[PDB]
């Protein structure tokens, strides 16, 4: 079936400017207290989450170097230490990961 | 590229039209534009109105004080004002206009016959009349378009010059023709503002020793709806004097007062037409 007539610019304006087809405004945008960048209420902050993932990559890069190959997963717990820190008694017999930089303020 | 210059010439004219509509030009006084001779224009002004003027007097009327200041400032880098003629011309018009009104409407109050004269010598009427007689074109001043207070002054100065040349009787015809005509089709209270018309009516009836009127409802329609019509009639000694329509009883009652007043002062709609027949 083919169109029997051309549709006019007036009719076309009514189809594509209908309120059903317009972009809706958002009411759930807020500012992040820690960084001051914007976020949605039900979603994690992107800027703050970006910090954590960067550190996570560094730790995992170090973990890869120590193991030296695949199929080398330890059977004991893991822990991370930064320069100026030494293992406690409770830390005995647990894999230790060493980072050159100092302990990040946010990391506890 | 077609050969010929005639189509290119025509299109330049249309580009001129388009530019004018989008960017209208600032006003200019006719003296600047071509085809202007001051002496000839003044003479035609008098002959147009079928009145004879003395050239020296008429020219003085158009000159204004502000014009003198501008010329001297340019001069640094004689004339004579129209102040004398303005005062004389305005004074006679006020007296002449009052004389016309009192004879036509003797009963009408004194304050009334002052409002109408003030109405007919205001900027609105005088400026409107002045422009259509070319007075603005012949005026000499430092600002164009001419401000209304300046335009009004030069108008009465011209009447003053006419008074000196041809005397009172001629000028009285001049005021009748051009100023009295402006009240055609105008209702009284449109030119005179009266609040609380009933209060004024009560005092007027007292002077002739008539009893205060009694308000009553002569006719009624659609009272409970949002579009009601009311007729209220003022009854005196059980005798009807006036009847008025209105949306509400208070509005309709106030309307009856104005109808009554108009009859008392003889400024009704069906009153005798004014008389311009007299050639004297």
């Amino acid at each position: 079936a083919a169109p029997k007539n051309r549709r006019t610019i007036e009719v076309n304006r009514c189809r594509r400017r209908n309120p059903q087809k317009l972009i809706k405004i958002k009411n759930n945008i807020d500012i992040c207290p820690e960084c001051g960048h914007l976020k949605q209420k039900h979603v994690l902050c992107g800027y703050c989450y970006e910090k954590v993932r960067q550190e996570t990559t560094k730790i995992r890069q170090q973990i890869g170097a120590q193991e030296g190959g695949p199929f080398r997963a330890p059977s004991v717990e893991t822990m991370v230490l930064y320069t100026g820190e030494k293992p406690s008694e409770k830390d005995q017999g647990k894999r230790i990961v060493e980072r050159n930089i100092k302990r990040p303020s946010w990391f506890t | 590229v077609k050969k010929g210059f005639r189509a290119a010439f025509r299109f330049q004219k249309e580009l001129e039209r388009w530019r004018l509509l989008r960017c209208p030009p600032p006003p200019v006084r006719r003296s600047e534009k071509p085809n202007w001779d001051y002496h000839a224009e003044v003479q035609a002004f008098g002959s147009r109105l079928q009145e004879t003027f003395s050239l020296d007097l008429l020219k003085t009327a158009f000159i204004n004080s502000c014009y003198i200041k501008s010329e001297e400032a340019k001069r640094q880098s004689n004339l004579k004002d129209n102040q004398e003629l303005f005062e004389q011309g305005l004074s006679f018009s006020h007296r002449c206009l009052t004389q016309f009104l009192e004879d036509e409407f003797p009963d009408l109050p004194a304050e009334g016959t002052e409002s109408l004269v003030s109405f007919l010598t205001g900027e609105a009427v005088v400026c409107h009349v002045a422009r259509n007689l070319a007075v603005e074109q012949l005026t000499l001043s430092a600002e164009f378009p001419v401000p209304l207070p300046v335009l009004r002054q030069t108008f009465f100065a011209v009447i003053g010059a006419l008074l000196q040349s041809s005397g009172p009787e001629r000028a009285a015809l001049f005021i009748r023709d051009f100023l009295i005509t402006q009240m055609t089709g105008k209702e009284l209270f449109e030119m005179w503002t009266v609040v609380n018309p009933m209060g004024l009516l009560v005092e007027e009836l007292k002077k002739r020793n008539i009893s205060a009127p009694e308000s009553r409802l002569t006719r009624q329609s659609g009272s409970t709806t949002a579009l009601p019509l009311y007729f209220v009639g003022l009854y005196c000694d059980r005798k009807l004097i006036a009847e008025g329509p209105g949306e509400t009883v208070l509005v309709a009652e106030e309307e009856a007062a104005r109808v009554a007043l108009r009859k008392l002062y003889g400024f009704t709609e069906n009153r005798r037409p004014w008389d311009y027949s007299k050639p004297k």
Binding site: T8 | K2, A7, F11
Partner: protein
């Protein structure tokens, strides 16, 4: 291309200036605007004559309203005024009813009386004096 028409711009604008108040592509496309403008001109010419007939119907409608307020039908009112040698036309009669209510009422009584005189003359037969308002002035 020795000779080419150099004036087509102004020939187009003659049609399109008469189409600016239309709706649709009729107000800017020459092949469509030209057809619509000629249809408008034909309607304009035929409506000059129809206008005069329409206004007469309006006058007759308003006259019937004014007469019935005094109890008269339209045919009786118009016919009897003619028998009294009154030659006012329908256009002016409408003006009196709207703007001169008292004068219109006077004419209403005159037409009614002449009608009554005709009825009396019809029923009574033989030679009898003619009605006061039923006397016709003559010209020569």
């Amino acid at each position: 291309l020795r000779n080419r028409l150099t004036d087509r711009y102004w020939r187009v604008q003659e049609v399109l200036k008469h189409a600016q108040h239309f709706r649709g592509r009729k107000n800017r496309c020459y092949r469509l605007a030209v057809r619509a403008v000629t249809r408008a001109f034909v309607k304009c010419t035929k409506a000059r004559r129809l206008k005069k007939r329409n206004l007469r119907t309006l006058w007759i409608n308003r006259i019937t309203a004014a007469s019935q307020e005094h109890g008269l039908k339209y045919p009786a009112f118009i016919v009897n005024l003619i028998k009294c040698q009154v030659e006012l036309n329908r256009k002016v009669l409408v003006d009196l009813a709207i703007y001169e209510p008292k004068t219109f009422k006077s004419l209403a009584a005159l037409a009614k009386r002449r009608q009554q005189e005709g009825f009396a003359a019809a029923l009574g037969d033989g030679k009898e004096p003619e009605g006061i308002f039923s006397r016709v002035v003559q010209y020569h």
